[PDB]
Design a binder for this molecule. Sequence first.
Ligand code: FAD
Ligand SMILES: OC[C@H]1O[C@@](CO)(O[C@H]2O[C@H](CO)[C@@H](O)[C@H](O)[C@H]2O)[C@@H](O)[C@@H]1O
Length: 538
Amino acid sequence: SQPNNFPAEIPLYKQSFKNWAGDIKVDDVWTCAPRSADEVVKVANWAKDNGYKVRARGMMHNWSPLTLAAGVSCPAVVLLDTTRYLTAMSIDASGPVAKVTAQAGITMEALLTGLEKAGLGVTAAPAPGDLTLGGVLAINGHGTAIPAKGERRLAGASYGSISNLVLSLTAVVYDKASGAYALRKFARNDPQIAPLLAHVGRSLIVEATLQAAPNQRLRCQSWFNIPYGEMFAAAGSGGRTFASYLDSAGRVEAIWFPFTSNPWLKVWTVTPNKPLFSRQTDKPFNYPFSDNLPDEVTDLANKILSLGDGKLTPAFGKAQFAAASAGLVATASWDLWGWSKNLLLYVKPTTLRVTANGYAVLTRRENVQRVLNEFVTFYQARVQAYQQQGRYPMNGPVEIRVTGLDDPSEAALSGGVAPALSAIRPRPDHPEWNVAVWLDILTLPGTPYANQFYREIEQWIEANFNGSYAAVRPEWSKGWGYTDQAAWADSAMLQTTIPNAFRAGQPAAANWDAAKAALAAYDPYRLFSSPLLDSLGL
Ligand SMILES: *Cc1cc2c(cc1C)nc1c(=O)[nH]c(=O)nc-1n2C[C@H](O)[C@H](O)[C@H](O)COP(=O)(O)OP(=O)(O)OC[C@H]1O[C@@H](n2cnc3c(N)ncnc32)[C@H](O)[C@@H]1O
Ligand SMILES: OC[C@H]1O[C@@](CO)(O[C@H]2O[C@H](CO)[C@@H](O)[C@H](O)[C@H]2O)[C@@H](O)[C@@H]1O
């Protein structure tokens, strides 16, 4: 069924949709590539009269079904490929803090490269460069960074998600006076912007202005000689704990392969001059042996998933650790140095395709080690319980990152508001919770028992990280709300637990219900949604 009366000057065509993990694949989805923000608004106003949803089509990296659902032949949805034309950017350095305005289809690699050429950069960002700015803002995309002990924040920088850098944005919003959708610009100190800073797919952003700080030189050191029992030891310290590196450098990520002893630890340190033996790099993606999988790894993945040989999982984790550790040694990449974007961007899409769950655990900075040690202790014991039964649900690594919260005091204006729906929006009732520990576990899509295992982990995370100790919000882009059959399917999590995570500690005027109401007012025809967003009641 071809859509009727579609704007004549905007070419409409069928194009398949396939997310990065490969588990959402829809054929022949009606797609167009708007040349301008005005063309986006034309498509929205046609869609409301014709019963089609409207979603931005970025790089299709998201795991959760926020664009459209899997298994739906040729949906009543029109996708707007923002990557072709909505990519322009400009920089205004006429104030005490530089500002970059960019159309929402630009990639993070292009954005950060444009900033570098102007002497500017950001504290943290997602590891891939092949993501649109609009996709990253929609789900509070983030990297890893908190301040090292003694570090002062640079004006125009933040330790939160990319959503926290927004100073202004232009969204497609219903204008009640004219009865039509139109472009509307919002300032970061306008409370009405709050649901749009990270709208989870409930809006369409055509352009945003972000703060940018003077660019930093970073060193990025990798270590594979620290046993997980030491790295993730109980608070009570001693040794090379993950928290000791947060204090010395502030920017830390651990990737811990299954059934292996030593995680791949990456530590980024702000380092003005290149250390004597560090290798300078002037490009991003410096771990080619991680981006280009060796045959040993791809062969084991295929045996495990396609041939059902799950007992090869421990060997598979060892192969993955070998690829990372011996690969870093072969490419002389364990101690790198250069402008920030070259070290912040480090994952290409040719890496191992995996699904992942994800959670942000808000807590006091001093509690990070406890959080990590608690999660690692529970995970190891569950993995063992499953291995006892001959099951290997998790065949990818555990990944740990830590960031600040989306605290508007870090935005370079007075009265900035927190994103209403960011997973790391602050908790007014707990001013002492000032970090978020991000926890994820990766596994090949479709691995037997994965959902059942992810459900056990999710139930324990919600039970454990509670009270005045910590709180939990799901990482929107990843898996959550698990039943034994699927992710994003548990009724209690969708109807009660997640919405409550956005009411706890918040004023009624700025909580889950207020955000939902504002997004509905901005989109009365409900153009901007997918079955998951409907099931969440957002
Ligand atoms: C695949 C992947 C993703 C990823 C990652 C590593 C890989 C291999 N590492 C990440 C990380 O280090 N930190 C982080 O926070 N996220 C990481 N991700 C996830 C990624 O950031 C998100 O999935 C992001 O949304 C992907 O961007 P992309 O451009 O690919 O977006 P999409 O999948 O097509 O769309 C996702 C949702 O965003 C909406 N969207 C996209 N553009 C807009 C605009 N302009 N306006 C409003 N909404 C927009 C889509 O409609 C959809 O709802
Ligand atoms: O971050 C410094 C780095 O940026 C460059 C451009 O790539 O210079 C930019 O920033 C300088 C310092 O503010 C400015 O002098 C210059 O005008 C601006 O382009 C590099 O030359 C510099 O090493």
